[PDB]
């Protein structure tokens, strides 16, 4: 996260770290959506241009964390994966369309003050809140600048951007399964996700029921926090029928 701040304790209790077993290193962010399901970006698990194709036994999830590098004894919980599910129409070949994946845990995680699931949006919460200028919140342990890494989880609040501005900021083909967020050059304020924040959540707090909803997944960008560029996020509601099909079936 570029130009963010340290998270408060328990601020993002659905935060998940995807962790490589060997060598031991951070791979991505992710989010807790129930006691046994974690949501992330497909490119965290599968990206053939970079020879990335992880199996379940390659990975762990670490839940309840604040410090990036510490083993947070008596606070974090470490879970093994039963199964990875990648969207069948995830487009790693072109533009990261449908950049979404689910991971089922081998055993349910116990909730605590530090471990709690985020909600997924219904159609009406999504329609109400996915509007240009409305702000969401992105969290992660990724890079602090484009070109280094934080002691603790970082947080930044960023406005959703009008779709024509998103489209006109890039040569990549933008789809309805994406949205973009960030400040415009003339707005002064700054901030962005960055490499290492992949897979983490873009959340909004509903003013109707005062619950946090995950509207996006950190997906891609061109550099980090560049003027005139915006961060791109997987549109969770647009892909929710797939999420529900996987959870119902498996």
């Amino acid at each position: 996260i570029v130009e963010g701040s340290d998270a408060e304790i328990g601020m993002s209790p659905w935060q998940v770290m995807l962790f490589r077993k060997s060598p031991q290193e951070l791979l991505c962010g992710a989010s807790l959506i129930s006691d046994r399901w974690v949501l992330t970006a497909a490119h965290c698990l599968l990206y053939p241009p970079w020879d990335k194709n992880f199996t379940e036994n390659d990975l762990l999830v670490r839940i309840g964390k604040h410090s990036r590098t510490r083993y947070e004894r008596n606070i974090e919980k470490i879970s093994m994966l039963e199964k990875i599910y990648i969207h069948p129409r995830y487009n790693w070949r072109e533009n990261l369309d449908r950049d979404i994946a689910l991971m089922k845990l081998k055993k349910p995680v116990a909730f605590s003050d530090y471990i709690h699931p985020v909600c997924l949006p219904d159609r009406e919460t999504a329609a109400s809140l996915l509007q240009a200028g409305y702000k969401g919140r992105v969290t992660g342990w990724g890079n602090l600048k484009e070109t280094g890494q934080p002691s603790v989880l970082q947080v930044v609040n960023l406005p959703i951007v009008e779709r024509p501005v998103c489209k006109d900021s890039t040569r990549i083909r933008i789809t309805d399964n994406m949205f973009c967020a960030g400040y415009k050059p003339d707005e002064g304020k700054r901030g962005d996700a960055c490499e290492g924040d992949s897979g983490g959540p873009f959340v909004m707090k509903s003013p109707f029921n005062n619950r946090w909803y995950q509207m996006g997944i950190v997906s891609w960008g061109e550099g980090c926090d560049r003027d005139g560029k915006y961060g791109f996020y997987t549109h969770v509601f647009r892909l929710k029928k797939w999420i529900q099909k996987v959870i119902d079936q498996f």
Partner: peptide
Amino acid sequence: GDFEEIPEEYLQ
């Protein structure tokens, strides 16, 4: 490290 080693139980 950069990462502190996690308990061995999680790597078995």
